[PDB]
Design a protein around this nucleic acid. Structure first.
Ligand SMILES: [Mg+2]
Ligand SMILES: [Zn+2]
Ligand SMILES: [Zn+2]
Ligand SMILES: [Zn+2]
Lengths: 49, 259, 46, 52, 67, 428, 98, 505, 115
RNA sequence: AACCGGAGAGGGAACCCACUC
């Protein structure tokens, strides 16, 4: 165990990857949400290019 | 120095709207009648809402707002009611309000449409506008497991307070369809389409100017929201304006005789 | 006294005590929404 | 004061039918925060009725 | 969200026309035909049905907090 | 044609954009390679036998309107406006209140604004479909009259219909959430949620604590106001001193929901969301999709507003003097096209650089529905009833309500709190 | 804890040298409207000092054609420095030249 | 040198044309917060003793009572009936009330006409409301601007603000000996249309307008036309607005220069010489040049000859009576006002084509070494100068043609002629031609190697290839012209931000 | 929080008077009438009826501020005729005019239904 | 048969976003 890396939503390693719209609605997630942001201490962060 | 004699003739009478014409009266009187139609005809709408449970997806004020806009058939009760501010009764009584109840729970797996039919009134006469194939006003949609219960009270008010007490849907008002007084000036009269009430051949664009004319033949089309009959809206408006002027007359007479 | 809460996952109404570690007795979950108040609420329809 | 913090109903005047919470009360009048609107007004004790 | 009860400008009751409007759009009435099939002549009332978006259906897709 | 035919049936043949790239039809070009390429703005209009300009075109553009961004792709007719107005609209589109996400009820977030009745624009560009704007829209198709009515709209202000607002026009709701985390931070010192008692607690505000439950939290559905206890938290005094959280002064809302859990440290944790309905009032900042911002100046009832022959009274009146300095012609064209679309039943198309639509065509279409071909109408004075001598430009336009309300800016002071270093009044 | 700090405060670098590290990266996602959320996820920042009197970097260059939106920039002190991305623009991810 | 201060407020501003230039409307919430300390005296002991009795609950009440000791009794937390009694030495901190003097400013204070005094009037909703003529000094906009208000806390400083910094006392600036306030926005336009020769008012419309004159003696003037029916005139009523016996001579914006030389000098066919004599408007059309902030305007002479009080009433009366007439007249702008006669479109197209051909043949001469450099200039400089000359001439000619095509009823012309908003170039840009986009004075530079965009041939110096926009804002811009126009607007937007850091320093 | 109640536009408080009469000192036989809690609906019809009187030298109305709810009516009459009786005569003629209109309207509506 | 009020704590540093010009 080296550590834990914060992971980006809807990325290939997020739990929401590949889910269908019905599944997302089951998880109280918006299908229209594009993801691409991190969750840290329960707050969204966006890496500005 | 005296009142002129006006005349009325109705060109269309329906359960939905009245269209009529007034002759031999001032522009100000016509405009004031048009004004009282919208603002100062008393009507009944639900104003007090107490929510006992609400598991829907719309918040309590959103449902209470939508409830306020539901028209209620108040044709003869509204005359015999009293304003809640004027009733000597300490709490709600049948002579100053009308009570409504709504208890709907969705249990089956189909989406439940809570509509105006679900509002259970206390009086057999004061009910929603869907009294007598068409659907009914949709309040909210409930998923399985959600419910809402609420108790409401309807009072008498006019448009001046809130738009929910507005009896009329659309008050079309016109006078002088062909520009004879020329209160409006068309830079290019050709481009302007003829009015419904205009009386001109296809060639002529506007009537010739006459300097001696005055506005007469006011055309009205009063379309009801469904709470009051279109024909009784006008009678109530005329009675209300006359009563308003009478109260001012009494207060001025009292003031002068005391002065 | 009883103060029933609603579980966040299975939405079961259940009772949990003062400083008791927040659990749902049926499931491995720890987010608990409160219950709507019992006192009168009155709104204007404006 | 006893009345402060007690839910009250307005039973007289134009505000009739409104519920509220007495924020500050005196022996002559009381400040009532209304439930329906986002405003706190002042109403005499005679129009108030304790509920609950 | 949900269909408004009354037209903002006119005040005509438009809250009961949404389900009928959708039903007529299923039957290859066009919007220009379905709207005046329901008795909406003023463009102020017509824009309500024409431009309304119904998000209440997406909200109902989510499971209720209670049961 | 075969590529378009395959793509048009894409749901059944899974023929996607990647296959189009693999076919050798399209290419990815960056700036370095764009220096040495010969582009064509439109294939039909620039690759033909004519007076030869270039005979060696190398690439062609899919559509010029793709040079815009996300916020700049919601402006109808952006090529009929002065470029600074487009920039102002791009900035102001980020502040228009709408439904920001579908699951906004399960989301405990500070500073959420949602509109009651959002509408998709009557006049739309073709690129709004890919932004899902029609699924999460941010404004209302109102009826605007560009007239100088009573002088309350003069410098960049707007007059509004009070009756329209009474019917839910631009009404919204505002959610604010508060978080509290009781923390065991000392040798004796433990924070704990409870109802503070007047005999036990050391020093507390004048606010009534009766709204709290025995848990130290309010039940959802309880009216709250400024200087009210939201969470009753006390710390033991080595009797006890409270650190209760009060409602933000003048926030003046209704408790929406209360969530209790454990943080990652195992301590109790509470989040409280509070509603407040915001009805538009004078001073609230509104805007159009062309950079025509402005506050509400006054609100007249339906009876007071000018009306057409038909009882149509504009929802918003804006002053004509805003146009000739700003040169937002796109605003006028949108209004005309919006009237056509509301009457026709179609949804107007306002893509930039679309050569198939212009003012003349829209005017001819509008002439068929019994209106003046240039959008002018004859309005009647609301007070006197006499018809206005001039004709008034009127029609449906898409307005946005910005988040800059007036109740969030007004404040005064008269000997309140003082700083600690130099004894001057605080800031903020 | 180091990654969490750098993505929570925005200071890109070691905590011990927080003044030396450039700030402003990893801002709080804007969640006012869907357009605001979409725009915030597609934003380029020039790491040049603000409040500078050199206006050449702030000007709209010809090479922004079809890759950076010309209309969309903040109108405050960061005019022409913070810029949004075109609709069909794609940023290369890189690959081995072997 | 600067510090936070007490007894100050700040909120959004909104217009109100029913206030005087020396009044400001404030919300009750702000008024009920801010207090002023009145010293008790046998004159006001009864008024203050009722005010203290009302308390902090009711708006017209008191918050604190300061005693001779400096002891500060707070009324908002259960005051005893014993210490509500007050003596002649005490001070009572009452709520701000109608007529109080306040200082008002907009935060970018650049000159002394930014911090001026006002009289408080209490109004129902949450915004500061100030009269529209006071907007010009503050540089306010009502587009979301915030302004802040300071309340004088003592009697000495109150009197000093009243006697030195009142608005009506600040009408003329010592910066350029011109008035600072003037008629502006839709009164200016409505005045030009109201005072034209062919404006006639029936009896009822006159009686309504006179109802809005504060300085009227209750004497209906003899109508300019008696018998066919009584008709008044716009000038005949505007004369009643003008105070005292003022005498000045001004020329309208559209006054031809040759009119004075020939006949009809004192009987103007165009109604374009303003002549006010013995406080009565005899002839002419009032425009920005007559009621604006220019030196020698009718308000400037009114302030110089009469007191500031009379000039204050003059401002208020103009706005009220003209705004009430615009209810009848009405004034708008639409898509019909930006359209031309199809004749003018063909003329504009021919002019553009001729100019474009002229640039092409200049390029041909330059390529064949047939262009002789201007003395003192280089071959590149003279080529650039010649091209710019041709394009500027084309734009001016097209603008003049569009101006001539405009009719009398056009609303763009109505706003430009009166000077209320817009200029003569905005009309040409909307209708005829947007023009040439410039970056740093020069044309659009070659930002890709030897060309402006990848859509153009290398070394293309033509008007289209370097930024000339031959379309109007009514006809829309081509995509290349759209991008070039964005490049032009970006330059001005940048300078706005850069300039301030230098000007303020 | 500063929004006035909706019923503020038509309800009289305790102590307020509906109509107040003030004599005008500038010119003879002039008077000013202040009506509380009224709007154009009443001022306009009263003014138009007054303008029909041959013995009325001046009649006008105004609302001092839209946010306030008050009307001011100025009436000047020739010297043989008080403004107060001119005002009451206009009211009592307008009332009669409206009553006649209502009666004719109801008769016409009855005749429209199978007539 | 017999008194029975009552407060005082939130500060600074840094960063970002936005607004009016
Ligand atoms: Mg401004
Ligand atoms: Zn009763
Ligand atoms: Zn569970
Ligand atoms: Zn409508």
């Amino acid at each position: 165990f080296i550590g834990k890396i914060p992971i980006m939503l809807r990325s290939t390693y997020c739990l929401l990857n590949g889910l269908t719209d019905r599944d997302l609605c089951e998880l109280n997630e918006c299908p229209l949400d594009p993801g691409g942001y991190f969750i840290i201490n329960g707050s969204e962060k966006v890496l500005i290019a | 120095p005296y009142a002129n004699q006006p005349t009325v003739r109705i060109t269309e009478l329906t359960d939905e709207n009245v269209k009529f014409i007034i002759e031999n009266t001032d522009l100000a009187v016509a405009n004031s009648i048009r004004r009282v139609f919208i603002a100062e005809v008393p009507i009944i709408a639900i104003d007090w809402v107490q929510i006992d449970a609400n598991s829907s997806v719309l918040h309590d004020e959103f449902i209470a707002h939508r409830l306020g806009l539901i028209p209620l058939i108040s044709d003869d009760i509204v005359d015999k009611l009293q304003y809640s501010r004027d009733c000597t009764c300490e709490e709600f009584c049948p002579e100053c309000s009308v009570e409504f109840t709504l208890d709907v729970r969705c249990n089956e797996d189909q989406t439940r449409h809570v509509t105006s039919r679900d509002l259970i009134s206390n009086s057999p006469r004061v009910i929603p506008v869907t009294s007598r194939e068409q659907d009914d006003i949709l309040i909210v949609k409930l998923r399985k497991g959600q419910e809402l219960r609420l108790r409401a009270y309807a009072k008498k008010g006019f448009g001046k307070e809130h738009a929910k007490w507005n009896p009329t849907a659309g008050v079309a008002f016109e006078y002088d369809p062909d520009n004879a007084l020329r209160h409006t000036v068309y830079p290019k009269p050709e481009e302007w389409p003829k009015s419904e009430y205009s009386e001109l051949d296809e060639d002529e664009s506007q009537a010739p100017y006459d300097p001696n004319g005055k506005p007469e033949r006011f055309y009205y089309n009063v379309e009801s929201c469904g709470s009051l009959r279109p024909e009784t809206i006008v009678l109530s408006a005329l009675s209300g304006l006359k009563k308003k002027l009478s109260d001012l007359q009494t207060q001025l007479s009292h003031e002068i005789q005391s002065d | 006294q009883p103060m029933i809460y609603i579980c966040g996952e299975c939405h079961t109404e259940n009772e949990i005590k003062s400083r008791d570690p927040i659990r749902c007795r049926e499931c491995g979950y720890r987010i608990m929404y409160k219950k709507r108040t019992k006192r009168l609420v009155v709104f204007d329809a404006r | 004061n006893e009345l402060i913090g007690q839910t009250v109903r307005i039973s007289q005047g134009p505000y009739k039918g409104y519920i509220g919470v007495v924020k500050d009360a005196t022996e002559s009048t009381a400040r009532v925060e209304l439930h329906s609107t986002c405003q706190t007004i002042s109403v005499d004790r005679q129009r108030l009725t304790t509920v609950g | 969200m949900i269909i408004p009860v009354r037209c903002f400008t006119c005040g005509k009751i438009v809250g009961n026309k949404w389900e009928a409007y959708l039903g007529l759009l299923q039957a290859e009435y066009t919007e220009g035909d379905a709207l005046d099939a329901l008795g909406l002549k003023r463009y102020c009332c017509r824009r309500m049905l024409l431009a309304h978006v119904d998000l209440i259906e997406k909200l109902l897709n989510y499971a209720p907090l209670e049961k | 044609k075969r590529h378009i035919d395959q793509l048009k049936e894409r749901e059944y043949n899974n023929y996607s954009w990647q296959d189009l790239v693999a076919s050798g039809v399209v290419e990815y070009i960056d700036t370095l390679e764009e220096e040495t390429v010969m582009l064509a703005m439109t294939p039909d209009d620039l690759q033909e036998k004519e007076v030869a300009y270039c005979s060696t075109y190398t690439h062609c553009e899919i559509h010029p309107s793709m040079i815009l961004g996300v916020c700049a792709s919601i402006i109808p007719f952006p090529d009929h406006n002065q470029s600074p107005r487009n920039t102002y609209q791009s900035a102001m589109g980020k502040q228009a209140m709408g439904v920001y996400i579908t699951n906004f009820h399960v989301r405990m977030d500070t500073l959420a604004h949602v509109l009651y009745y959002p509408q998709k624009p009557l006049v739309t560009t073709r690129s709004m479909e890919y932004l899902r704007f029609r699924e999460l829209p941010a404004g209302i198709n109102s009826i605007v009259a560009i007239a100088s009515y009573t002088g309350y709209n003069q410098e960049d202000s707007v007059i509004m219909n009070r009756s329209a607002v009474d019917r839910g026009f631009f009404r919204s709701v505002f959610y604010r959430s508060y978080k509290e985390q009781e923390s065991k931070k000392g040798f004796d010192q433990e924070e704990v949620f409870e109802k503070p008692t007047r005999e036990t607690c050391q020093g507390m505000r004048h606010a009534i604590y009766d709204k709290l439950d025995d848990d130290g939290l309010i039940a959802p559905g309880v009216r709250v106001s400024g200087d009210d206890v939201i969470i009753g938290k006390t710390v033991t005094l080595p009797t006890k001193r409270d650190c209760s959280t009060f409602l933000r002064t003048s926030e003046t809302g209704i408790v929406d929901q209360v969530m209790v859990t454990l943080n990652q440290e195992g301590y109790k944790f509470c989040k409280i969301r509070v509603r407040s309905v915001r009805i538009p009032q004078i001073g609230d900042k509104f805007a159009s999709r062309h950079g025509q911002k402005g506050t509400c100046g006054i609100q007249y009832r339906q009876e007071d507003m000018p009306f057409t022959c038909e009882g149509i009274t504009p929802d918003i009146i804006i002053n004509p003097h805003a146009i000739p300095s700003r040169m937002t012609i796109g605003h006028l064209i949108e209004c005309l096209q919006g009237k056509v679309s509301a009457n026709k039943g179609e949804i107007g198309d306002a893509t930039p650089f679309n050569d198939a639509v212009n003012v003349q065509k829209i005017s001819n279409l509008l002439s068929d529905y019994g209106y003046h071909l240039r959008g002018n109408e004859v309005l009647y004075n609301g007070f006197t009833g006499r018809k206005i001598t001039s004709q008034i430009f009127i029609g449906p336009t898409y307005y946005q309500r910005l988040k800059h309300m007036v109740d969030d800016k007004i404040h005064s002071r008269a000997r309140g709190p003082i700083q600690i270093l130099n004894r001057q009044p605080m800031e903020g | 804890d180091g990654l969490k700090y750098s993505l929570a405060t925005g200071n890109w670098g070691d905590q011990k040298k927080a003044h030396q590290a450039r700030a402003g990266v990893s801002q709080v996602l804007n969640r006012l409207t869907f357009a605001s959320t979409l725009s915030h996820l597609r934003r380029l920042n020039s790491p040049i000092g603000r409040d500078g009197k050199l206006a050449k970097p702030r000007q709209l260059h010809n090479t922004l054609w079809g890759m950076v939106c010309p209309a969309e920039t903040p109108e405050g002190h960061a005019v022409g420095l913070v810029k949004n991305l075109a609709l069909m623009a794609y940023i290369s991810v890189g690959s081995q030249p072997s | 040198m600067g510090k936070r201060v007490d007894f100050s407020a700040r909120t959004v501003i909104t217009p109100d044309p029913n206030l005087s230039i020396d009044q400001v409307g404030v919300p009750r919430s702000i008024a009920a917060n801010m207090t002023f300390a009145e010293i008790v005296t046998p004159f006001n002991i009864d008024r203050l003793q009722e005010l203290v009795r009302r308390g902090n609950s009711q708006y017209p009440g008191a918050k604190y009572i300061i005693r001779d000791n400096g002891d500060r009794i707070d009324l908002r937390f259960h005051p005893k009936p014993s210490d509500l009694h007050l003596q002649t030495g005490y001070k009572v901190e009452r709520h701000m009330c109608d007529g109080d003097i306040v200082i008002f400013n907009r935060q970018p204070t650049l000159h002394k006409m930014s911090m001026m005094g006002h009289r408080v009037r209490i109004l129902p909703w949450s915004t500061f409301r100030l009269n529209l003529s006071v907007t010009t000094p503050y540089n306010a906009d009502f587009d979301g601007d915030e302004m802040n208000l300071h309340l004088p806390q003592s009697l000495e400083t109150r009197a000093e603000i009243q006697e030195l910094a009142m608005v009506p006392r600040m009408i003329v600036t010592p910066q350029s000996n011109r008035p600072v306030m003037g008629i502006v926005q839709d009164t200016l336009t409505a005045v030009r249309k109201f005072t034209k020769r062919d404006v006639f008012l029936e009896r009822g419309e006159v009686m309504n307008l006179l109802m809005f004159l504060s300085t009227w003696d209750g004497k209906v003037p003899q109508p300019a036309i008696l018998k066919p029916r009584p008709l008044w005139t716009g000038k005949q009523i505007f004369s009643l607005i003008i105070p005292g016996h003022i005498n000045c001579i001004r020329t309208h914006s559209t006054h031809p220069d040759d009119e004075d030389s020939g006949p009809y000098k004192h009987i103007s066919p165009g109604d374009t010489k303003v002549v006010v004599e013995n406080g009565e408007l005899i002839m002419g059309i009032l425009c920005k040049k007559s009621l604006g902030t220019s030196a020698g305007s009718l308000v400037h002479i009114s302030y110089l000859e009469m007191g500031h009080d009379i000039t204050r009433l003059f401002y208020s009366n103009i706005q009220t009576v003209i705004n009430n007439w615009l209810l009848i007249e009405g004034h708008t702008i639409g898509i019909g006002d930006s359209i031309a006669d199809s004749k003018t479109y063909q003329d504009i197209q021919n002019t553009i084509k001729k100019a474009k051909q002229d640039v092409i043949e200049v390029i041909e001469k330059a390529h064949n070494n047939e262009l002789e450099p201007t003395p003192g200039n280089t071959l590149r400089q003279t080529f650039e100068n010649q091209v710019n000359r041709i394009l500027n001439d084309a734009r001016d000619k097209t603008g003049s043609s569009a101006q001539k095509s405009l009719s009398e009823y056009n609303n763009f012309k109505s706003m430009v002629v009166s000077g209320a908003k817009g200029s003569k170039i905005n009309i040409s840009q909307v209708i005829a031609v947007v023009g040439q986009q410039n970056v740093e004075g020069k044309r659009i530079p070659f930002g890709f190697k030897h060309r402006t965009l990848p859509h153009f041939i290398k070394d293309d110096y033509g008007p289209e290839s370097r930024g000339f926009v031959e379309n109007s804002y009514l006809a829309g811009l081509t995509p290349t012209e759209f991008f070039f126009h964005a490049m032009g607007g970006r330059e001005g937007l940048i300078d706005t931000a850069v300039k301030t850091a230098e000007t303020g320093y | 929080m500063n929004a006035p109640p909706a019923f503020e536009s038509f309800l009289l408080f305790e102590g307020e008077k509906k109509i107040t009469i003030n004599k005008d000192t500038k010119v003879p036989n002039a008077c000013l009438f202040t009506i509380n809690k009224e709007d154009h609906t009443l001022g306009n019809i009263i003014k138009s009826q007054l303008l029909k009187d041959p013995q009325v030298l001046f009649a006008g109305y105004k609302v001092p501020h839209p946010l306030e709810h008050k009307i001011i009516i100025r009436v000047q009459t020739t010297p043989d005729y008080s403004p107060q009786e001119a005002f009451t005569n206009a009211i009592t003629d307008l009332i009669s005019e409206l009553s006649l209109l209502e009666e004719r309207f109801r008769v016409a509506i009855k005749d429209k239904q199978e007539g």
